Design a protein around this ligand. Structure first.
Ligand SMILES: */C=C/C1=C(C)C(=O)N/C1=C\C1=NC(=C\c2[nH]c(/C=C3\NC(=O)C(C=C)=C3C)c(C)c2CCC(=O)O)/C(CCC(=O)O)=C1C
Ligand SMILES: */C=C\C1=C(C)C(=O)N/C1=C\C1=NC(=C\c2[nH]c(/C=C3/NC(=O)C(C=C)=C3C)c(C)c2CCC(=O)O)/C(CCC(=O)O)=C1C
Lengths: 482, 482
């Protein structure tokens, strides 16, 4: 995309993380085709000497007696003299990958997850607010991971992050409310975090351990590690954590009706290894919250719309009552402007501008129309920064930063227009928004930014966002007048 | 009415189930005030030799040592000789209530409950419909308890009950789709379960265990067992049970937005007990269900209404493009019919009615038109049973079985009437509904009924009920008039 950022395929780096071991088999005699460089830490034999040998003459017997449970369910606890190891099974690039990983050792771990579901799942939950919602998910994952600091990290329509809630050990500082550049996580990450919702960086200060061969022969590329648990993340992002003063990361994607609604982030000053099962315990915690977020959002809009229908029905009974239309409007203005939460309205229903409330001048709205009487909007047209779509009213951010316009007739210049003032807004970016990184001599080898302090940009000349419940309300106002 | 199957003080029976012991101390020395009569089993002394004694002597070290956690978290496991029992501590009638009942003895239950959570959360459950969702639940809450049958049991607007999802053994006489009269779960019990969300009947044939003394000295009534888990239930439900040939039942209240939506049943034919832990595990299962529902419910009504105002505005572009109305309403005749999912629409805007579609004749709409304006409604108005209230039409259930009118102004008698024909429905109850219970001669005893075979009734004259979109489509269609 924009950079080489959005180019570096992160799943094809040929590097596992030093806390596990990777074995890759193929065919119907399950010969060994790729193996991680630290095999002998668990095996007792040089990796180089086991390539091209059957499963049965490589995997230790301890693992072999579990081979049937393994191929069945994908995951089984097996004991080697090394302790207890969670072995994972999954398919990749024409092979049956096996990854070995230190098992979980807290027995009542899973009971513990039952309780933090309970806090997160309850009814009368959020009665304090859909932010406590995010506050509790934050605390809950913390109480289950034992991490220093857990944040809930959402994407805006620019794909730029902000931390909506935080939960954090003392001595840890705070990035709550701070915003985060779009390229802090490029696209190839964003879509890979769309299928794979789990990810552990167990030691940002350790050395990614390579496979051997570094390439699948028939493929002349490394094995695809898109499904790997032991995948070593991108070195810049390792260099990024290191800037952050952090030595381990874990995050969980918040899928909500699909799109990444954001993440659940986890930082720990030292390294920490989190079992596969706790890792899964934590997944359901996200899934739940996304489900919690989903039921309250719908609810929130529901009431909003009803509260709007309150007005159209009283506006309506106001009408039909008596007088012409220039009559009820006079008395009705204090709901006419409420239908969309607006500050003034224009009305070109026939006679000269009937201007109500706080509004641009007659000639200015007699101009604004002519131009709006040329653009391709069908029934409704809303925009929250009019100054860049029509600079005639650029300077008038006082009353006409945001406009919402409805077409009260076919090819007719007859409309209504709701104006809305700007609302100043302070975004607290985490590092300089101008430079997300620092590009070396030769635009060649980027390097993440190591200053993560607050910046202070003031948003101006932009109204409040025209909500879902506004568009409905004005469309409703459309079918209401002559 | 208020049958004696409403008055039965269920929380005042005075006894417990045999699988557990109840102790109730009081004051600052916690002297034994009330104690179950099977207390020797777990103590070493006659129940009636322990009344009047401080808590320390009677209760054996095992549970004393763990007093502070039991108090704080409400319960604790406690390995006695008798067995791993799980003590439970609440307050009632001014007395601390200690309940012992035997505790879960299978290691990995919690892991197991976790995995079944991941069966109801899902990337998206109900993808096959709100049906899958329900069944899936009944599947889950059976795969974890082990009961021979589980059913989901929703209460209708009159607190009658119908079964809508059911998991059961092979060769198992199931009750899906069937309806159950509302006295099968009297009022008082629903208040209580509205308080107490879970309950066990481990042995339906077994017989309650006396409490000692019978009435709490200072009350002259027996201890309030409303927050009891060993609470024996009314004997008339136990008969009911054995009538159904069942041996152990278990039920979990389905609370959502504060309206007892229904109950997940459970029924084993040999007597079986589930531990509090395991039961608790099913509380999340029932808690998560309602959450998954509420979100689907809001969703669908959102999908719906948007469609409704889609045509409403399609009904408004109709407006400005034709100086016609009595024609416009006939060119797009059914767009108005299908705001309300209707058959035919009646308008008396002024002169002669504008009957359009399937609808009675002018000479009859006029009849329910005038008497109508003599009603106590104010904007919308509607029934599915036009007869019951308007007998001049109780025979035209073919075109006007339910109506939904809407005033078009304050005074003056102009409205729109949307009509629906009847739809016939054949629901099978479980046994006769006319004789839900059976009394001895003298009318102060009432057993349950002799059988629950499919007694089938066929509903005529009633249409489908007008839903939210219906009344909200119709309300916004009024507005677009005046
Ligand atoms: C009017 C009298 C009653 C009739 C008739 C009747 O059927 N019940 C009447 C009174 C009470 N019912 C109480 C509870 C209750 N009843 C049922 C129904 C069933 N249990 C089953 O096992 C089946 C089998 C398919 C059915 C239909 C239930 C589930 C309950 C709830 C109790 C539980 O969890 O088992 C009741 C109070 C009992 C209490 O004290 O909780 C009364 C007084
Ligand atoms: C073009 C290169 C990049 C620049 C410049 C940059 O700033 N980031 C770049 C690339 C990637 N980021 C990736 C993943 C990723 N980023 C974040 C964002 C964070 N913001 C913060 O404040 C912190 C705090 C320490 C972080 C971590 C996050 C959360 C992730 C996901 C990883 C995780 O485990 O949380 C990636 C993808 C790497 C991969 O191999 O998957 C790239 C390339």
């Amino acid at each position: 995309d924009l950079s080489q950022c959005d180019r570096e395929p992160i799943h094809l780096l040929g590097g596992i993380q030093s806390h596990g071991v990777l074995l890759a088999f193929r065919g119907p005699d399950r010969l060994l085709e790729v193996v991680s460089a630290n095999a002998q830490a668990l095996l007792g034999r040089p990796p180089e000497t086991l390539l091209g040998q059957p499963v049965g003459r490589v995997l230790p017997a301890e693992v072999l007696a579990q081979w049937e449970p393994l191929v069945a369910r994908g995951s089984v606890r097996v004991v080697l003299p090394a302790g207890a190891y969670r072995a994972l099974l999954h398919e990749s690039d024409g092979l049956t990958v096996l990854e070995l990983e230190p098992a979980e050792l807290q027995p009542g771990m899973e009971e513990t997850a039952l309780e933090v579901v309970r806090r997160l799942v309850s009814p009368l939950a959020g009665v304090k607010g859909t932010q406590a919602l995010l506050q509790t998910a934050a605390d809950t994952v913390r109480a289950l991971t034992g991490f220093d600091r857990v944040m809930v990290y959402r994407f805006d329509a620019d794909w730029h992050g902000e931390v909506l809630a935080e939960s954090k050990r003392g001595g840890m500082d705070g990035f709550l409310g701070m915003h985060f550049p779009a390229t802090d996580i490029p696209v190839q990450a964003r879509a890979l975090y769309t299928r794979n919702p789990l990810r552990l960086i167990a030691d940002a200060r350790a050395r990614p351990v390579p496979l051997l061969p570094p390439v699948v022969p028939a493929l002349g590329r490394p094995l695809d590690l898109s499904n790997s648990a032991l995948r070593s993340v991108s070195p810049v992002h390792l260099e990024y954590l290191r800037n952050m003063g952090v030595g381990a990361s874990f995050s969980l994607s918040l899928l909500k009706e699909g799109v990444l609604w954001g993440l659940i982030a986890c930082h720990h000053l030292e390294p920490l290894h989190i079992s596969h099962e706790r890792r899964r315990a934590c997944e359901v915690l996200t899934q739940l919250l996304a489900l919690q977020l989903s039921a309250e959002e719908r609810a929130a809009e529901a009431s909003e719309d009803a509260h709007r229908a309150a007005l159209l029905g009283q506006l309506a009974t106001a009408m039909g009552e008596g007088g012409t239309l220039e009559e009820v409007l006079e008395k009705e203005s204090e709901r006419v402007l409420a239908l969309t939460g607006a500050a003034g309205v224009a009305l070109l229903l026939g006679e000269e501008p009937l201007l109500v409330g706080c509004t641009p001048a007659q000639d200015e709205v007699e101009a604004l129309v002519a131009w709006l009487a040329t653009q391709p909007f069908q029934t409704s047209f809303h925009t929250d920064r009019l100054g860049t779509v029509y600079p005639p009213l650029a300077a008038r951010a006082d009353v006409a930063a945001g406009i919402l316009a409805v077409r009260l007739a076919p090819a007719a210049a007859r409309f209504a227009i709701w104006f809305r003032p700007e609302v100043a807004r302070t975004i607290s970016w985490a590092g300089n928004p101008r430079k997300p990184a620092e590009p070396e001599p030769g635009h060649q080898r980027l390097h993440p930014r190591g200053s993560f302090q607050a910046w202070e940009e003031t948003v101006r000349d932009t109204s409040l966002p025209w909500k879902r419940a506004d568009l409905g309300a004005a469309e409703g106002f459309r079918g209401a007048l002559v």
